[PDB]
Amino acid sequence: SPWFGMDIGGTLVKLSYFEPIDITAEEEQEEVESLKSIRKYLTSNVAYGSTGIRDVHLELKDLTLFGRRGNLHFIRFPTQDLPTFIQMGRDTVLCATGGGAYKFEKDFRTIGNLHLHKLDELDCLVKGLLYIDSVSFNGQAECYYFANASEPERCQKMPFNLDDPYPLLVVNIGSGVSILAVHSKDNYKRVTGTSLGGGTFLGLCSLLTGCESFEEALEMASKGDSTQADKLVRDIYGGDYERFGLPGWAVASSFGNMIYKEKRESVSKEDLARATLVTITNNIGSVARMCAVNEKINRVVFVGNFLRVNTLSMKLLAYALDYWSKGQLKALFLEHEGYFGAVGALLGLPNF
Amino acid sequence: SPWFGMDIGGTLVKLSYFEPIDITAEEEQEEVESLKSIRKYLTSNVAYGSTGIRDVHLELKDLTLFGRRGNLHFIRFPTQDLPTFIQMGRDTVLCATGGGAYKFEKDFRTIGNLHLHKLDELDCLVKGLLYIDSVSFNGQAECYYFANASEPERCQKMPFNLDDPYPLLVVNIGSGVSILAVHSKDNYKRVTGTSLGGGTFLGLCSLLTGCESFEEALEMASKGDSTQADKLVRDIYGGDYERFGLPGWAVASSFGNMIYKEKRESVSKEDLARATLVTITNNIGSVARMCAVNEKINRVVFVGNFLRVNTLSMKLLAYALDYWSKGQLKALFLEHEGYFGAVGALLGLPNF
Ligand SMILES: Nc1ncnc2c1ncn2[C@@H]1O[C@H](COP(=O)(O)OP(=O)(O)NP(=O)(O)O)[C@@H](O)[C@H]1O
Ligand SMILES: Nc1ncnc2c1ncn2[C@@H]1O[C@H](COP(=O)(O)OP(=O)(O)NP(=O)(O)O)[C@@H](O)[C@H]1O
Ligand SMILES: CC(C)c1ncc(CC(=O)N2CCN(c3ccc(C#N)nn3)CC2)cc1F
Ligand SMILES: CC(C)c1ncc(CC(=O)N2CCN(c3ccc(C#N)nn3)CC2)cc1F
Ligand SMILES: [Mg+2]
Ligand SMILES: [Mg+2]
């Protein structure tokens, strides 16, 4: 049986696959052709069909897991294409998490004799996050922050040590947002969540600009000026609101300048994309700040695929969390940020 | 000099005007024609030009203020039309608050010999709120809540006593959102704020539906189904997410079903209006809940004109705050909710 961990989210399926690299001469003969075809298919291709992708840069090489050495691979595809995945399987013990482990349980059982083991998505997230940081990213730090995030000429990605990770606030930005407080390896809770997450960015962006992919939405946003759509403090006060330390550049009302018809007629799609990104990102940061204050936790780590290839939102979070907390909170990021649930699911294999 | 209080916000100007009703025979002769023309103009019209409105239902009758008896009137017009207001004035001590008291200071001083006194918008809000509740709404309660907000066959507006109003969390929903913690008549602070407020509702609604007024946006929303645009917990899990008590009907991702092109092509403008309203309203409620928990305050009063003629958002707030706090927080509302800053400004007149 191949060793796989699957996190079926509302938008993306994430798959962690352990490729053994210590296969003995006797073991290669004993392996069945279907198993060899799967291993070869997965390791000789980086694109799978039309929508599956192997994130080769994230591979952990020569990892020791369950007493074997191998490479840990990280693979993603849209949940909309899970029927293709299952149909290919019909042409193994599967540890699965995410909402889709429940929603699609009956579909996975169409694969004869397959044993599906549903695992909790936040249990798997915490276990996978702690594990990956513990083994390191091929000797490099898994965790990083942006040093001097308020000064663009200095701002730079820097490694951050999580050897004693507790306590930790984890902000999981998927379709929506889950906020977790982790006090130990066995003591964690879901503090709250928000509905304004990555699916809001992508959904609103598509409605407003006609973009047809997450990457196109980010490309548009990179070219836009959110202040063409947003109403700033200085638009209301003429400058800073000094009594409460609100700088003129702060957003007072997201999309608030779109109440004027002439401004709706002049705004560009790129401006709207950037305002959508800024609106969602600042709200996530603000909710994270309030939760960190209430939980008395000063390290805030952001995960989920809203931040994949999204340096704009990462840098906005780093700057905003530091600025609005007056330096009391630190924004942290993880190289394997979308895959922790899939890894945590894989890690449950020995229990079955 | 007529007694006026003005709150110049980012979107609306609010004006409180005290009409004396104890004018003696000698006083009517001494009054100048311009003053008599202003009082007559204000009290014989309910529409002023094309965009000014007197909210006659809010009038406080036979109020004793500064040692005189009179009627307190409540008048609003768009900040975009303030040049018309100022030009009419050029054809008095003015206590003014809101950002526009600063932004338009030089414009108010084009009225010869006018004395402008800028007052802080959250100082005025707290003072006006406490004052109006203290004098009552013509003998009725100024404050109300929705009893049994979780059961539509029972849910009904009911009066609420604020005779000892402290402590109180005040959520001011204007263009954006300000959240205040009031501990006494002289001890209050701005806890935080959000950029996702009434201008976000109106701005996004206009972009998405082509509506041309706040009232039209609400009319559209009243006919729509937000679940056509939003991705719910049951869309991801197939039902409830039981481990964390998330019901299937909860929104997991606002506008999250709009990542699918075929759903964008089927959604109605009314659906989009309702999803915008629900998205903004739930986020305001959630931020209010987190702030109330951190401030250790269990009464949350919502003000600002986002809720004017907006029973949908008021009932959503009442239900959501009670549901998501497991009954620990109570949503409160005020009949004069958009006008407290203007009243607090008027109340500063004796200091000058
Ligand atoms: N290739 C992509 N396709 C779609 N969305 C993408 C893609 N890449 C990045 N994203 C973003 O990543 C978000 C989904 O993140 P992800 O952590 O995989 O959520 P999920 O697990 O599928 N949803 P959930 O059930 O709420 O946990 C989307 O909402 C987008 O904002
Ligand atoms: N006639 C109207 N015109 C515009 N907006 C309206 C109207 N009626 C209700 N609204 C809503 O009321 C909101 C403005 O509320 P209001 O409390 O008057 O804010 P403001 O004081 O002008 N803004 P701010 O400077 O942020 O405090 C708008 O964003 C709309 O959502
Ligand atoms: C008084 C009126 C005109 C008014 N209404 C609303 C606002 C918005 C506001 O108050 N804020 C503060 C909190 N903020 C963030 C952002 C990111 C993070 C992170 N990470 N944290 N906080 C968002 C904007 C301003 C304002 F002047
Ligand atoms: C696990 C994944 C699939 C997921 N991701 C996000 C959510 C959203 C969420 O967690 N919530 C709770 C807080 N909530 C409100 C709303 C109003 C108030 C008031 N007043 N308070 N809270 C909003 C929705 C669900 C969810 F299953
Ligand atoms: Mg997920
Ligand atoms: Mg205001």
Please, where are the H alpha helices in chain A? 25-30, 33-44, 82-90, 99-103, 105-108, 121-135, 198-209, 214-223, 233-237, 261-266, 269-295, 311-324, 340-347
Asked if residue B156 and residue B49 are part of one domain, the reply reads no
Q: Using DSSP, state whether A20 is helix, strand or coil.
A: strand
Asked if residue B7 and residue B118 are part of one domain, the reply reads yes
Boundary of a domain, candidates B267, B296, B322: B267
Which is it for the CA torsion A98, A104, A109, A110, positive or negative? negative
First-to-last C-alpha distance (Å) of chain A: 13
CA distance A66 to A74: 18
CB neighbourhood size of A337 (10 A): 22
Asked if residue B209 and residue B195 are part of one domain, the reply reads yes
Beta strand pairing status for B168-173 and A330-334? Answer: unpaired
Q: Specify the DSSP element, H or E, that contains A157.
A: strand A156-159
In which residue are the tokens 């799609």 written? A269
How far, in Å, from the CA of A336 to the mean position of ligand 1?
14
Asked if residue B188 and residue B110 are part of one domain, the reply reads no
CB neighbourhood size of A351 (10 A): 8
Q: Which of B301, B350, B310 is nearest to B172 (CA)?
A: B301
In which residue are the tokens 């994949």 written? A308
Cα–Cα separations (whole angstroms), residue B7 to A237, B99, B174, B284, B306: 12, 8, 12, 22, 16
Asked if residue B197 and residue B68 are part of one domain, the reply reads no
Residues with CB under 6 A from ligand 4: A 10, 99, 176-178, 192-195; B 233, 236, 241, 246, 250-252, 282, 285-286, 289, 320-321, 324
Asked if residue A215 and residue A129 are part of one domain, the reply reads no
Asked if residue B237 and residue B168 are part of one domain, the reply reads no
Any idea of the CA torsion for B86, B91, B94, B100, to the nearest 10 degrees?
Answer: 10
* Residue range of the domain that includes A74: 1-140+339-352
Question: Strand order in A330-334's β-sheet?
Answer: A156-159, A143-147, A330-334, A299-303, A168-173, A177-182, A188-194
Which residues, including other chains, have CB under 8 Å from residue A3's CB and lie 6 or more apart? A17, A18, A65, A66, A346, A349
Asked if residue B251 and residue B189 are part of one domain, the reply reads no
What are all long-range contacts of B240-244, with beta carbons under 8 Å and residues at least 24 apart? Answer: B241/A99, B243/A120, B243/A122, B244/A122, B244/A190
Residue B270, phi then psi, degrees to nearest 5: -65, -45
In which residue are the tokens 């003969």 written? A29
Residue B168 per-residue DSSP state: E
Is the CB of A173 inside 8 Å of chain B's CB atoms?
Answer: no
CA distance A192 to A294: 11
A298 token code pair:
């000063």
Asked if residue A238 and residue A202 are part of one domain, the reply reads no
Is the CB of B350 inside 8 Å of chain A's CB atoms?
Answer: no
CB A31 within 8 A of CB A37: no
Count of domains forming chain B: 3
Which residues are bridge partners to B158 per DSSP? B145
Which residues are bridge partners to B48 per DSSP? B52
Q: What burial class does residue B129 get, using C-beta atoms within 10 Å of its C-beta: 0-12 exposed, 13-18 middle, 19+ buried?
A: buried
C-alpha B21 chain-centroid distance: 28
CB A240 within 8 A of CB B208: no
Which residues, including other chains, have CB under 8 Å from residue B229's CB and lie 6 or more apart? A203, B254, B255, B257, B258, B263, B267, B271, B272, B274, B275
Boundary of a domain, candidates A215, A237, A267: A267
Which is it for the CA torsion A194, A197, A203, A205, positive or negative? positive
CB B197 within 8 A of CB B284: yes
Q: Specify the DSSP element, H or E, that contains A143.
A: strand A143-147
Boundary of a domain, candidates A267, A301, A330: A267
Residue of chain B minimizing CA distance to A248: B99
Asked if residue A151 and residue A62 are part of one domain, the reply reads no
Any idea of the CA torsion for A103, A109, A115, A118, to the nearest 10 degrees?
Answer: 0
CB neighbourhood size of A249 (10 A): 10
- Resolved by: X-ray
Mutate to test the interface with A, among B103, B108, B119, B196 (most CBs of A within 10 A): B196
Asked if residue A109 and residue A18 are part of one domain, the reply reads yes
User: For this structure, is B121 an active site residue?
Assistant: yes
CA distance B91 to B85: 10
Residue B6, phi then psi, degrees to nearest 5: -130, 135
Amino acid present at B36? K
Q: What burial class does residue B44 get, using C-beta atoms within 10 Å of its C-beta: 0-12 exposed, 13-18 middle, 19+ buried?
A: exposed
Asked if residue A229 and residue A103 are part of one domain, the reply reads no
Q: Using DSSP, state whether A181 is helix, strand or coil.
A: strand
